[PDB]
Design a protein around this ligand. Structure first.
Ligand SMILES: [Mg+2]
Ligand SMILES: [Zn+2]
Lengths: 653, 1319
RNA sequence: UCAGGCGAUGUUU
DNA sequence: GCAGCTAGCCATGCACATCGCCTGGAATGG
DNA sequence: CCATTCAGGCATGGCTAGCTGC
């Protein structure tokens, strides 16, 4: 390598061969004059040492250093190791036609398309642009065309649009855990220099917008374009191959939006009136003549498909809330109603989307997802849920509780001072008393928040669930939990110790009031412990994943049906406590082995070679089934593969 | 009372705890250490002196030739700081040393012959430290972090746990000197005591014991204790210290005075012992069987024939009893044992012993030290003598000796730097004692055992290495010296010394490239404390333990500031008040407690010293007279807090800040946030960028002033005085006579570093902030540096923000930013880049810099002068040419703008090795700088003389005043004006002599400077000229640049909305930034909300004032109002008596408030809710801190009252235009035909192993096939792909990966043979 | 165009 | 016993993707 | 400068030499 000037950064390989050759030649020379045996032996020794080094430095005693201190890099080096060829240029490698930048939000896209910066596109598609150019003859030769692009003249942008119009790209994020970590999209040309990505797929990428970077690749071969559009465009991953549940579950902003858009007040504008149609419902809410949310009777209409795949109309009156109806306006035809009648928490809307899918196919579900997002942001911003200090309500009896605990601890202290008890059980008494006090505190604060709302009703007074912003953000399921809002309002209680055991004097003060020094000092190492543990945990997990893939690599579903009669007996699992997994979810999606009979004997219920989807599973729950012998990959009788019917539903489809 | 400058903008201050000890200087570490490294100090004591007096004098090989030291001296730099940066050569200073070689006569005692005095021989230069603690190595600005590492001395560790899962614990002990080889003792689970040296192998410690010329009996006598049997007619009377048998049961019968006390099965009891010791007879009855279970102590031999009865280390038996009885030796020496008190460990190891003499001992020693050799006796002798007694190859520090003796409960703290038999033996005794469960192990983590070096230490150690390198050749030539016909400098060689020191500074795990983009960042990255580096440990060989914050970091090492990621708990920052002890430990201040009165006597304490006492926590009220208000109080004693009585206390805290670093003690309201976000916010704050304007953060913490002063990036006047001349370039101050020297009284000038380059390409700059003709006080601000304002630190700006979700545009954490902002240029910031284009003369000929270039555009050429280099001030974009460099073929190698980086060329630099044609533009530039510097020093002398004659006038006023003959005849003709010969006349002569001296020195400095600019400076070998350019981009803000608050609330601006669209208040003002509420209750950084409130309070006071003033209301109203505004609050130490100002002295305060009323907050003592509330109530804004808003889109009313206020946000320096990057088809790596890696190099991304997993996971096949072959490897197929593309035919053809081809070849190089079949 | 060394950045939950 | 056990010694292994910056083989007759 | 030179980990496992049976 010629560096700056007529010098060269030395390569260990060159140095090693050079050493060996010097040694060999001096030796061969000595085999012309018959030096004594001690000489020739020490010489041969040198040479053997040399060759040993060349093949595999280090493996034989102290590695011969190189320039300054380093174990200079040998051939065995150049193969093995985290930087050798196998792991550095064969498994994964660098790639042309690619770019990287910062991502952002842009909530105005349909989720089969993500933004893309204009400069970046132009630079990605230089070839195709040249092509279309000297097709339409606006240019003549390549060199000229290159200069054209350099100029960035007028026609070029139109042509670039033309080549974009249908050609997907792949987006990627670095710590690529699972199959979702790569997806496809269709470009839409944008100013600026950032990538606008549809806000749903953030959850899938596990990628917030706090500066994380994503990379884009471009397919070239026509095969690959089809590959992308048929197997990698986000409109086919709404179900994680991890488990059956969906993955395009909406998240924090939108869930807050819905939760506010559907929740009963008790006495607000526009009450008790009745409304013919969600249409006029929305009309009211925009007019401002009625609450966004107030109990009200309306007429609604729904469609079922109890027929042989054909819809049946019906309609009725319902008792509900304006906003709830307005929500209803969107839902596609074939769905029940009570689904969107309750408070619509996170799990709620998740299950909602799920059932939508597994009754009405795909296209309706996608379009439904997008409508959910739009309406969610709209009404959220309309509401304006904000945090403010006043929200975090310090409880009243907190001081009383903590003083009580103080006194009782002091009494235990006197008891030990009277030598009755021993340090161990003393310690134990104290930890337990603080635990119980903590519980009482948590009860108090959560009570106050959840139920505080108490207002008249055109009658006298009445309590109800609250509109306190923080409790709302919690109960939705958007962010936080009892744990975290507890650390806000009530005392955060107890903290660990460098040993891993626990302190003998808990934190007595929450975050609304400030901590005094020593408390905060403790909390420091409290946090830092996990904060540093996270790296080791990361690494160890990753090593696990690698090892797994390299051992279960070559298993492929090649044959169709081994046609056999084995199986295993799935039963729902219990730990003598309650059932912890219901047979429904443990069996759902796998394939029968021996035809199940009714508990009424000799009354065979399901043929022995069927696949259990929802309706059959529900029939199982009907007839209150015990356990099922079921086909499983562990026992298929294929050769170099695994027969489909022994594997089951392809989750994600 | 406040300084006039302070009066510019006083700051309101909450806070109760009265601060008694002010903040100390923030660079104590750097400056003190280095100032200590370089000084003319007597009596050795840690300097160049120390290293010298160590290494010298060098005596000959008895050739009577002694090379002695005399004295040293450091001259003055050939250059200075400015020109040094400009060129690139280091910033050093000559090293001149007085040595002297004397020669006696042979044949006699010290009969002298001759000496020679090579006065101040040169031995290569060492660098120096600017008065900002920064070095300058090669035009750069590097800094040496201070290292933390294990104190020398000795330690006693558990090694719990992994002990073979036998549930047992081991015990090791380590002696670790400051320079030499280590030493280790440890037990094996079979209770065997072993030593090792530097972790090679294991040997039985008795080996070294015997090695120190000891015998078996010597050793045993020394460790174990004596027990005597005495032969008699019968009953074998034994001697018994009673307490000896306090623990283990005596299975036989024991009587005294006939009276039995103990029998079989009788365990000895406390009353047993008491009555026995009351009896006190130590010649008592014994059986015979029990004795047989012992080990002989000494060595008995036959009565007459003296033949071996029994060697020591031998158990009793029948035959031994018989052969001693036939001797009848009335003395029997044995060694007591007690498994609960006293083990035979040593003697068992003695059993293990292979050898039995000093000689074979040392033999085995060498045989493990260096493997495989016949050991010469005296050779191994000298070797072992050379391990632990070399005055040179081995050394404890004085520090070592101290900590050592202290740990051994010795009495004194001085003596040998090397070991002793007594020392090692005592060590082993301590080890045994702990093995006996008395004496505690000692945790490493305890900062009573970590130690902080610094630059002083580093340079000293390295320099000493250099000297002992030279001394070899020194004594070589000396021993082979001639007859007096030589000279010292003949014998000496600066080459190795300079080599070592340069290697150290310019290349080290410590000496790192100083971050500079932000004043706080500088002053941090100077105080940092790392445990990496030489003589330390590695980024991977440390677990939970050394990372965790031991409970004694308190007040010494900040707990909450540390870079997360790979290395945590390794990059501690040194706390605010922390000081380096005399020895090197970290001591901290405390307040002395008398009987019941808190004296304001500060008092420093180390780590271990703190352990004894008990300390009161800062937040604790008191009755004005050192009386604690309560009588029980929380305190801490020994890693344990509790509540105590009143009389128990010892010492009290200093200030409620002393537990955090400057890296964190700016974060307002820290006391509310969690540690996680506290940390993240601290670092982000460290990464700010200087805006184009500073704007005094509304919500500060009173440390701002301190940091701004202590950094080096602002100008503090060294003497009080009066403004005499302001000018965007310079500032000129007349001094006050009371603080003036008689001679060269004169005045002072401060130049100002104008627009120039950081190490991070940010725009370091300075500005004046004083109007003409104004008083200034000794030690005050004059030149606000980058991101400074009127003397306080200011990083970002304050912005009217509002928490409310909005149409998704703030989905995860995405800030949304109104256009009002980007209009008013309040995040625009400057960047500078340095682009070089060297030129060489190499094979096939020389390069040239003509303006002519083949096959270019005259249009492009238009921006070039006839000399080739662009003018000063063009506006260039990408692709433009800056310098025409040509190659003999002839081919272009011109330097062009990097892609997509606009800007303007602000300055040019040219260098050319001497002996080469200075071309046209070079000459022009040279003459230009010449005129500049001439003007410069000329003006210096001119206005200096102006002031000097003014002072003359001042003098002539008294005594022989002559107004007419004064103001008329030329001021130079003031030698013979009428006045007496008073010392006033003498001082007139003083002024005149300094006049003439200014003249002459001005002359010589002019000349030398001319020659400096005239010469053609050096370069690398093989280069003709170098052309440096400077661009200057003006980055605006735009979608996708990380902004962030001071609480870890990160964010990425995403859409630039038009003024219409931002929500607006009921009164019209829009709101600038919109954050996302959903970000709070998880990242529990609740602080930012309170910050926002208190902000709005401030700005409310503001608008009130601004209205009042635009009303042109009278001053009385303002006095009343502002006075109220400060006087509010429950209780403070602030006290501003606005009734004590002039009417000018106030209106200015108003006009500096009208943007807002800054507010302070000590870290753990700041404001509280009710206080903020009442402040707002003084304002005219609702208590709840929330408002009803309106939506510009619909002009309707949002439903719930939302939160607005002012947050102080920062623009980080991850800028989209540097992250964004792409590639179509660039170069290809040379060894493997793969694309390169990086942005700088026009490389491409890395499609990684996990992505390949991903594609296999989908059914995708063709895609992966492509992205492994066509896009990447095959030369052939790659090109053919490109062709098929441009011809509009999307289709590939595989080929085989060249990389795999390479793998094959490498294996085939190894002895293997891998092939490829063919079916 | 090569290997190091430094920091820094993201993976918080 | 020679069969089996057990202790000690050493081989093997420890996320991914960036972005700056810098700094380099050098020594020794003649 | 051109010819020739040369000092802190942790877990697991797999083995090899003793240790010591019954
Ligand atoms: Mg992130
Ligand atoms: Zn099967």
């Amino acid at each position: 390598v010629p560096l700056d000037g007529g010098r060269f950064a030395t390569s260990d390989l060159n140095d090693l061969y050079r050493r060996v050759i010097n040694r060999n030649n001096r030796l061969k020379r000595l085999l012309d004059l018959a030096a004594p045996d001690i000489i020739v032996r020490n010489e041969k020794r040198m040479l053997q040492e040399a060759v040993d080094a060349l093949l595999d430095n280090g493996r034989r005693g102290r590695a011969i250093t190189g320039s300054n201190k380093r174990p200079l890099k040998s051939l065995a080096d150049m193969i093995k190791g985290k930087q050798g060829r196998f792991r550095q240029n064969l498994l994964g490698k660098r790639v042309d036609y690619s770019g990287r930048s910062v991502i952002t939000v842009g909530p105005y896209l349909r989720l089969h398309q993500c933004g893309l910066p204009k400069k970046m596109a132009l630079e990605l598609f230089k070839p195709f642009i040249y092509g279309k150019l000297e097709l339409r003859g606006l240019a003549t030769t390549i060199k000229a065309a290159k200069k054209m692009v350099e100029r960035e003249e007028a026609v070029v942008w139109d042509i670039l649009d033309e080549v974009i119009r249908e050609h997907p790209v792949l987006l990627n994020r670095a710590p690529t855990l699972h199959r979702l970590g790569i997806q496809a999209f269709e470009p839409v040309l944008i100013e600026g220099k950032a990538i606008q990505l549809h806000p749903l797929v953030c959850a899938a990428y596990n990628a917030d917008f706090d500066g994380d970077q994503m990379a884009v690749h471009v397919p070239l071969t026509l095969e690959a374009q089809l590959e992308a559009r048929a197997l990698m465009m986000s409109t086919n991953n709404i179900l994680s191959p991890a488990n059956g549940e969906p993955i395009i579950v909406p998240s924090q902003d939108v869930v807050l939006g819905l939760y506010y858009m559907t929740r009963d007040c008790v006495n607000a504008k526009g009450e008790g009136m009745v409304l013919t149609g969600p249409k006029e419902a929305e009309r009211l809410y925009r007019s401002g003549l009625a609450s966004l949310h107030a109990r009200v009777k309306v007429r609604i209409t729904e469609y079922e498909k109890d027929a042989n795949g054909e819809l049946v109309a019906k309609t009725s009156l319902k008792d509900t809330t304006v906003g709830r109806a307005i929500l209803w306006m969107i839902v596609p035809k074939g769905l029940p109603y009570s689904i969107v009648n309750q408070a619509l928490g996170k799990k709620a809307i998740s299950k909602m989307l799920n059932t939508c899918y597994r009754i009405l196919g795909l296209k309706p579900t996608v379009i439904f997802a997008d409508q959910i997002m739009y309406t969610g942001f709209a009404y959220a911003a309309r509401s304006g849920a904000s945090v403010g200090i006043d929200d975090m309500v310090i409880p009243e009896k907190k001081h009383e509780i903590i003083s009580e605990a103080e006194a009782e601890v002091a009494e235990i202290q006197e008891q030990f001072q009277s030598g009755l008890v021993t340090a161990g059980e003393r310690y134990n008494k104290v930890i337990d008393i603080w635990a119980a006090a903590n519980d009482r505190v948590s009860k108090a604060m959560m009570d106050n928040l959840q139920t505080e709302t108490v207002i008249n009703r055109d009658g006298q007074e009445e309590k109800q669930v609250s509109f306190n912003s923080i409790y709302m953000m919690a109960d939705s399921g958007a962010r936080g939990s009892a744990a975290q809002i507890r650390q806000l309002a009530g005392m955060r209680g107890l903290m660990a110790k460098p040993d891993g055991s626990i302190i003998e004097t808990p934190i007595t003060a929450n975050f609304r009031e400030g901590l005094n020094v020593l408390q905060y000092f403790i909390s420091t190492h409290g946090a830092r412990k996990g904060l540093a543990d996270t790296a080791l945990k990361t690494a160890n997990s990753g090593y696990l994943t690698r090892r797994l893939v390299d051992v279960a690599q070559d298993l492929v579903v090649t044959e169709d049906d081994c046609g056999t009669h084995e199986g295993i007996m799935m039963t729902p699992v219990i730990e003598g406590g309650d059932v912890k997994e219901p047979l429904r979810d443990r069996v759902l999606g796998r394939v029968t082995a021996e035809d199940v009979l009714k508990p009424g004997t000799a009354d065979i219920l399901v043929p022995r070679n069927t696949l259990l989807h929802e309706q059959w599973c529900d029939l199982l729950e009907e007839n209150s089934v015990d356990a099922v012998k079921v086909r499983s990959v562990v026992s298929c009788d294929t050769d170099f593969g695994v027969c489909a019917h022994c594997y089951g539903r392809d989750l994600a489809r | 009372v406040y300084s006039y400058t302070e009066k510019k903008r006083i700051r309101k201050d909450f806070g109760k705890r009265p601060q008694v000890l002010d903040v100390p200087y923030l660079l104590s570490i750097q400056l003190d250490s280095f100032q200590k490294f370089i000084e003319q100090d007597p009596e050795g004591q840690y300097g160049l002196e120390a290293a010298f007096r160590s290494v010298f004098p060098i005596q000959s090989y008895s050739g009577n030739s002694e090379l002695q030291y005399v004295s040293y001296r450091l001259g003055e730099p050939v250059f200075d700081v400015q020109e040094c940066q400009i060129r690139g050569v280091t910033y050093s200073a000559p090293l001149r040393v007085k040595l002297r070689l004397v020669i006696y006569e042979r044949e006699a005692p010290e009969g002298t012959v001759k000496d020679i005095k090579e006065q101040e021989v040169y031995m290569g230069e060492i660098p120096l430290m600017t008065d900002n603690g920064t070095f300058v190595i090669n035009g750069t600005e590097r800094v040496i972090v201070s290292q933390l590492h294990r104190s020398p001395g000795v330690f006693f560790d558990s090694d719990k746990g992994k002990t073979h899962s036998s549930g047992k614990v081991l015990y090791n002990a380590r002696i670790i000197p400051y320079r030499g080889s280590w030493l280790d003792f440890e037990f094996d689970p079979k209770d065997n005591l072993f030593v090792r040296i530097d972790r090679r192998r294991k040997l039985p410690a008795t080996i070294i014991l015997r090695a120190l010329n000891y015998t078996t009996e010597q050793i045993l006598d020394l460790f174990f204790e004596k027990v005597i049997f005495e032969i008699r007619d019968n009953k074998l009377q034994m001697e018994l210290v009673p307490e000896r048998l306090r623990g283990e049961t005596a299975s036989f019968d024991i009587e005294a005075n006939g009276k039995v006390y103990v029998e079989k099965g009788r365990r000895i009891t406390a009353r047993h012992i008491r009555q026995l010791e009351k009896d006190d007879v130590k010649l008592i009855e014994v059986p015979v069987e029990y004795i047989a279970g012992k080990v002989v102590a000494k060595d008995y031999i036959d009565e007459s024939t003296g033949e071996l009865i029994c060697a020591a280390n031998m158990e009793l038996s029948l035959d031994l009893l018989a052969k001693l009885s036939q001797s009848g030796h009335k003395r029997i020496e044995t060694l007591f044992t007690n498994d609960l008190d006293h083990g035979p460990y040593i003697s068992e190891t003695l059993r293990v012993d292979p050898t039995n003499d000093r000689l074979s001992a040392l033999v085995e020693i060498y045989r493990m030290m260096r493997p495989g050799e016949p050991p010469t006796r005296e050779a191994a002798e000298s070797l072992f003598e050379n391990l632990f007694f070399s005055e040179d190859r081995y050394d404890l520090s004085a520090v070592g000796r101290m900590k050592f003796n202290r740990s051994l409960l010795r009495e004194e703290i001085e003596g040998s730097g090397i070991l002793s038999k007594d020392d090692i033996i005592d060590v082993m005794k301590k080890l045994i004692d702990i093995r006996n469960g008395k004496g505690e192990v000692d945790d490493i983590d305890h900062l009573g055992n970590r130690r902080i070096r610094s630059v002083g230490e580093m340079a000293e150690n390295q320099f000493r290495v250099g000297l002992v390198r030279v001394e070899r050749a020194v004594k070589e030539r000396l021993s082979l010296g001639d007859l007096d016909t030589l000279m010292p400098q003949d014998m000496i060689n600066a080459k190795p010394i300079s080599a070592a020191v340069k290697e150290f500074f310019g290349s080290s795990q410590l000496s790192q490239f100083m971050d500079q983009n932000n004043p706080l960042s500088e002053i941090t990255h100077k105080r940092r404390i790392s445990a990496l580096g030489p003589g330390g440990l590695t980024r991977e060989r440390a677990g939970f333990e050394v990372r965790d914050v031991h409970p004694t970091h308190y007040g010494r090492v900040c707990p909450i500031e540390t870079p997360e990621g790979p290395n945590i708990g390794l990059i501690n920052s040194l706390s605010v008040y922390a000081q380096t002890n005399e020895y090197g430990f970290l001591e901290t201040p405390y307040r002395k407690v008398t009987d019941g009165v808190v004296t304001d006597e500060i008092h420093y304490l180390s780590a271990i010293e703190e352990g004894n006492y008990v300390i009161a926590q800062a937040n604790s009220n008191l009755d004005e007279e050192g009386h604690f208000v309560e009588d029980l109080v929380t305190c801490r004693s020994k890693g344990e807090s509790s509540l105590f009585s009143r009389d128990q206390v010892d010492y009290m805290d200093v200030s409620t800040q002393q537990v955090v670093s400057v890296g964190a003690s700016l974060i307002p309201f820290l006391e509310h946030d969690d540690a996680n976000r506290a940390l993240m916010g601290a670092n982000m704050q460290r990464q700010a960028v200087p805006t184009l304007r500073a704007d005094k953060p509304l919500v500060g913490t009173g440390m701002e002033r301190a940091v701004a002063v202590d950094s080096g990036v602002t100008a503090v006047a060294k003497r009080g005085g009066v403004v005499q001349y302001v000018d965007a370039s310079r500032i000129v101050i007349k001094v006050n006579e009371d603080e003036m020297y008689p001679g060269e009284a004169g005045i002072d000038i401060y130049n100002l570093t104008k627009y120039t380059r950081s190490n991070q390409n940010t725009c370091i700059n300075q500005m004046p902030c004083v109007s003409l003709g104004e008083p200034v006080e000794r030690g005050d601000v004059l030149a606000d540096g980058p991101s400074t304002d009127l003397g306080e630190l200011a990083l970002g700006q304050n912005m009217r923000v509002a928490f409310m979700p909005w149409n998704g545009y703030n989905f995860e954490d995405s800030i949304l930013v109104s256009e009002r902002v980007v209009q008013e240029d309040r995040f625009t910031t400057i960047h500078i880049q340095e682009l070089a284009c060297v030129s060489r003369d190499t094979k096939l000929g020389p390069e040239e810099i003509t303006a002519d270039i083949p096959n270019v555009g005259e249009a492009a050429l238009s921006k070039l002068d006839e000399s080739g280099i662009v003018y000063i001030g063009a506006e260039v974009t990408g692709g433009d040419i800056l310098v025409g460099k040509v190659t003999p073929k002839v081919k272009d190698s011109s330097l062009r703008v990097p892609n997509g980086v606009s800007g303007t060329v602000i300055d040019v630099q040219v260098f050319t090795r001497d002996g080469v044609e200075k071309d046209k533009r070079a000459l022009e530039i040279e003459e230009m700088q010449l005129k500049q510097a001439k003007k410069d020093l000329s003006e210096e002398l001119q206005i200096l003389e102006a002031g000097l004659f003014s002072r003359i006038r001042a003098v002539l006023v008294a005594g022989g005043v002559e107004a007419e003959k004064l103001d008329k005849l030329p001021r130079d003709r003031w030698l013979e004006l009428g006045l007496t010969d008073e010392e006033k006349q003498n001082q007139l002569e003083q002024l005149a002599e300094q006049y003439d001296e200014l003249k002459h020195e001005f002359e010589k400095k002019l000349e030398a400077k001319r020659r400096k600019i005239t010469q053609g400076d050096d370069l690398a070998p093989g280069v003709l000229k170098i052309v440096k350019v400077y661009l200057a981009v003006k980055r605006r803000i735009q979608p996708g640049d990380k902004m962030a608050g001071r609480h870890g609330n990160k964010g990425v601006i995403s859409k630039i909305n038009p003024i219409e669209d931002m929500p607006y208040d009921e009164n019209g003002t829009p709101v600038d930034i919109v954050l996302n509420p959903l970000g709070v209750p998880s990242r529990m950084n609740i602080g930012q909300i309170l910050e926002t409130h208190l902000g709005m309070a401030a700005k409310g006071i503001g608008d009130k004032i601004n209205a009042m003033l635009k009303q042109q209301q009278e001053v009385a109203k303002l006095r009343e109002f502002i006075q109220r505004a400060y006087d509010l609050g429950a209780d403070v130490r602030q006290k501003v008596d606005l009734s004590t100002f002039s009417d000018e002295e106030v209106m200015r305060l108003a006009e500096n408030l009208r943007k807002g009323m800054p507010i302070a907050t000590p870290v753990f003592d700041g404001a509280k809710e009710a206080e903020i509330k009442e402040l707002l109530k003084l304002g005219d804004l609702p208590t709840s801190g929330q408002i009803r808003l309106y939506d510009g889109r619909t002009g309707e009313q949002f439903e719930r009252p939302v939160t607005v206020g002012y947050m102080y946000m920062l623009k980080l320096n991850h800028l989209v235009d540097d992250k964004m990057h792409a590639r179509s088809t660039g170069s290809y790596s040379l060894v493997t035909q793969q694309p390169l890696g990086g942005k700088a190099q026009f490389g491409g991304q890395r499609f990684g192993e996990m992505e390949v997993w991903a594609l296999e996971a989908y059914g995708a096949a063709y895609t992966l096939q492509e992205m492994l072959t066509v896009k990447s490897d095959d030369v052939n197929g790659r090109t053919k792909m490109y062709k098929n593309i441009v011809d509009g035919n999307h289709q590939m053809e595989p080929g085989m990966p060249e990389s795999f081809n390479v793998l094959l070849k490498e294996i085939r190089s190894l002895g293997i043979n891998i092939e490829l079949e063919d079916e």
